[PDB]
Design a protein around this ligand. Structure first.
Ligand SMILES: Nc1ncnc2c1ncn2[C@@H]1O[C@H](COP(=O)(O)CP(=O)(O)OP(=O)(O)O)[C@@H](O)[C@H]1O
Ligand SMILES: [Mg+2]
Ligand SMILES: [Mg+2]
Ligand code: NA
Length: 359
């Protein structure tokens, strides 16, 4: 019996139901844009459970016993079985507001509010936005437009590995005992990503050394001429605060959102061609050593896997989980973990491998 929780399912990248889930992902994204949080959640949970199936749906009988498939979702599945297409998802793909939101938020530094503002101003293309003489752009958006073609092309595994080498070389220069781990999509086995994410931790660094590392590493890259964009968010981490009760838990660790200049010579791929370098989005997170397993688990994702992990912890175990800690409300104790496996064992869950968290 398939669990309603993604954290009790193994979801690998061999999706046999992409015809259904691509349509459900589009419908979920449109509900996010139309501020319909409820309908968005229902389509996300349905899409997530179909991604876990070891076989393709070929008839309505195949949906029997599958949880998170409401009447609205089953009508969409029925229509795709009928014609090979979703008329509902097709209408969203042709919707002017949806097309504009997807196009505008494809720019680094552009969120829902700015995308909505530009749409209501009558903008429909990035060319008309960039060349406008009255518009004022944030420093984030300026970088988003300047490095647009590189950022919109997918980061591949040779590029992610080349970035990992750069991160490790910079980090060990200031903290030689530091542990650097690639997280996000690439840790889940993806071939491509929009960015490359890393978790950095040090067993012997002080509170001040931990705070200064991201400033030292980015100043080093600025000196090398590799820092194209940099935004460092200081830590708001509280060692003894209870974990978040929120559906989407906020991360309080020190972090930075970067754009790095990746020279072609550093990339060992099958394939100089153009300018000789590529702009790469990189996120770095620094966490205290004792919280490394919670941070790794939170930053590995997927977003749906994290949501269900926290929901399961609260509703089934009366535990509070976030990226910083695990608290047991019955025992009235914080639970320690040196690995992700120990977190899963505390929660009474079978261990799910990172490549099985693609919910
Ligand atoms: N502010 C934040 N707080 C908590 N977790 C976060 C976070 N930002 C990102 N994450 C987590 O870190 C993982 C990597 O984040 P992202 O880079 O935003 C998406 P991804 O799953 O890696 O695919 P992608 O980078 O190709 O789009 C996510 O799967 C999510 O669980
Ligand atoms: Mg990522
Ligand atoms: Mg990221
Ligand atoms: Na954006």
């Amino acid at each position: 019996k398939i669990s309603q929780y993604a954290c009790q399912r193994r979801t690998t990248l061999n999706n046999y139901n992409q015809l259904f889930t691509d349509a459900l992902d589009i419908l979920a994204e449109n509900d996010e844009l139309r501020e319909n949080e409820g309908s968005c959640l229902a389509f996300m949970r349905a899409s997530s459970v179909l991604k876990s199936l070891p076989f393709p749906i070929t008839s309505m009988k195949d949906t029997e016993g599958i949880p998170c498939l409401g009447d609205k979702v089953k009508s969409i599945i029925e229509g795709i079985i009928e014609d090979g297409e979703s008329s509902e998802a097709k209408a969203v793909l042709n919707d002017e507001r949806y097309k504009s939101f997807k196009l505008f938020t494809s720019v680094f530094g552009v969120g829902l509010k700015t995308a909505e503002k530009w749409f209501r101003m009558g903008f429909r293309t990035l060319s008309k936005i960039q060349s406008d003489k009255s518009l004022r752009f944030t420093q984030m958006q300026k970088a988003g437009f300047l490095y647009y073609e590189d950022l919109v092309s997918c980061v591949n595994r040779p590029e992610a590995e080349a970035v990992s080498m750069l991160v490790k070389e910079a980090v060990v220069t200031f903290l030689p005992d530091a542990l650097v781990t690639m997280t996000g999509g690439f840790r889940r086995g993806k071939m491509t990503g929009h960015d490359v994410d890393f978790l950095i931790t040090s067993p012997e660094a002080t509170e001040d050394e931990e705070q200064q590392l991201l400033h030292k590493v980015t100043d080093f890259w600025k000196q090398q001429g590799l820092l194209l964009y940099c935004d460092i968010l200081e830590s708001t981490f509280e060692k003894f605060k209870q974990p978040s009760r929120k559906v989407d838990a906020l991360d309080h660790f020190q972090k930075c959102f970067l754009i790095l200049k990746l020279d072609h010579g550093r990339v060992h791929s099958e394939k100089q061609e153009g300018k000789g370098w590529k702009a790469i989005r990189v996120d770095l997170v620094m966490c205290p050593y004792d919280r490394r397993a919670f941070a790794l688990l939170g930053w590995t994702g997927s977003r749906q896997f994290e949501r269900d992990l926290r929901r399961y912890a609260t509703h089934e175990r009366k535990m509070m989980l976030d990226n910083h800690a695990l608290y047991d409300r019955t025992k009235r104790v914080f639970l320690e973990a040196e690995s992700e496996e120990e977190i899963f064992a505390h929660l009474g869950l079978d261990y799910i491998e990172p490549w099985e968290r693609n919910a």
